[PDB]
Enzyme design. Sequence first.
Site, PDB file in Angstrom:
ATOM      1  N   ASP A  35      -5.156 -10.838  32.740  1.00 44.11           N
ATOM      2  CA  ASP A  35      -6.399 -10.573  32.040  1.00 44.11           C
ATOM      3  C   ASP A  35      -7.197  -9.441  32.671  1.00 44.11           C
ATOM      4  OD1 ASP A  35      -8.672 -10.629  30.597  1.00 44.11           O
ATOM      5  OD2 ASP A  35      -9.392 -12.604  31.414  1.00 44.11           O
ATOM      6  N   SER A 199     -13.721   5.670  23.610  1.00 40.87           N
ATOM      7  CA  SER A 199     -12.819   6.236  22.631  1.00 40.87           C
ATOM      8  C   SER A 199     -13.528   7.374  21.899  1.00 40.87           C
ATOM      9  CB  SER A 199     -12.368   5.167  21.623  1.00 40.87           C
ATOM     10  OG  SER A 199     -11.641   5.768  20.563  1.00 40.87           O
TER      11      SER A 199
HETATM   12  N1  LIG Z   1     -10.516 -11.786  28.702  1.00 44.52           N
HETATM   13  C1  LIG Z   1     -10.656 -12.794  27.802  1.00 44.52           C
HETATM   14  N2  LIG Z   1     -11.076 -12.615  26.601  1.00 44.52           N
HETATM   15  C2  LIG Z   1     -11.260 -13.882  25.909  1.00 44.52           C
HETATM   16  C3  LIG Z   1     -10.779 -14.910  26.937  1.00 44.52           C
HETATM   17  C4  LIG Z   1     -10.653 -16.295  26.770  1.00 44.52           C
HETATM   18  C5  LIG Z   1     -10.128 -16.997  27.867  1.00 44.52           C
HETATM   19  C6  LIG Z   1      -9.786 -16.327  29.050  1.00 44.52           C
HETATM   20  C7  LIG Z   1      -9.906 -14.941  29.198  1.00 44.52           C
HETATM   21  C8  LIG Z   1     -10.395 -14.240  28.088  1.00 44.52           C
END
Ligand SMILES: NC1=NCc2ccccc21
Length: 330
Positions: A35, A199
């Site tokens: 993430d 962007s």
């Molecule tokens: N980076 C993320 N965007 C939505 C989300 C939900 C749960 C964990 C990480 C994320």
Amino acid sequence: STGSATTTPIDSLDDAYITPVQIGTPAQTLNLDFDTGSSDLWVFSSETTASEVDGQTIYTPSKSTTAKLLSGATWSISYGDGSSSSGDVYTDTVSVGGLTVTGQAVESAKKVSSSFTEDSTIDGLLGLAFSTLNTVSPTQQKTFFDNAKASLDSPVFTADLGYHAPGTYNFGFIDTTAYTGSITYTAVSTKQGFWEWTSTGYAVGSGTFKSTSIDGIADTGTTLLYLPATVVSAYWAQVSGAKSSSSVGGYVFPCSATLPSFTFGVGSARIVIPGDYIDFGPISTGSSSCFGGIQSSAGIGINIFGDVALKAAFVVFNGATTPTLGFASK
Ligand SMILES: NC1=NCc2ccccc21
């Protein structure tokens, strides 16, 4: 050093991607959501509330000879979809595709919200945003990338997500066979802890390119593409029958539709998201109303280049002294 791991969509919609991660001695392999929108490495564990674990693989620190409790440290995080988790912290050996970090903060979940419980395919998250966002208290901890960076051949990682197919996360090198043409680099602001960039514009299908600055973040942990309402309205106006639905929570469209592509700018370069990437299937099982992959960021407070956009590109997260982001077609 380098590492290279395969990342796999969790379901037929590419709702998220999981990457195997080895934690502890002997290794415990958990499938984590890499993430770039967050900065905590947290896992389902032997400490997680029994009732909140439903099929996930758990980390058991007591089974690892290299785990050490990080005394007094706790963590607590809330994500943009309203989900959350919290717990305590260990340090342990963590390896991703052959790349090993000793002494990595592994955040052990004592509590997770329902959305996590409900998703048996994700065993935790591995954050790849800036460590300034890390939630550990009272001593903030570094991300896997930050800890490995000095060891890497080059201080970079790359995201190559697939459309309904596996992809790759590489650490420490750029695979020049994995993209076409050249990589266009663009400035990053780290001021909010994110891979935040601007962007240069967009196009809808075979539409003319609109030059306009759109500030947002490169976020592999977000599924969809969240953009200003004007942009999104322009997109969905090209789809017969499409409508913003308050009841569903966004733009929906007839499942019988053929969607136009969406182009976004990176400097003078252009990344084309094919129409099929924007289809997230029936809103409920059996419905002929489908959920859109491009949605308004109004009320989020930030634009998000989530997986729908990133999977159209080979993306370089350049962690040099002054970080930058690179995009290439593929
Ligand atoms: N980076 C993320 N965007 C939505 C989300 C939900 C749960 C964990 C990480 C994320």
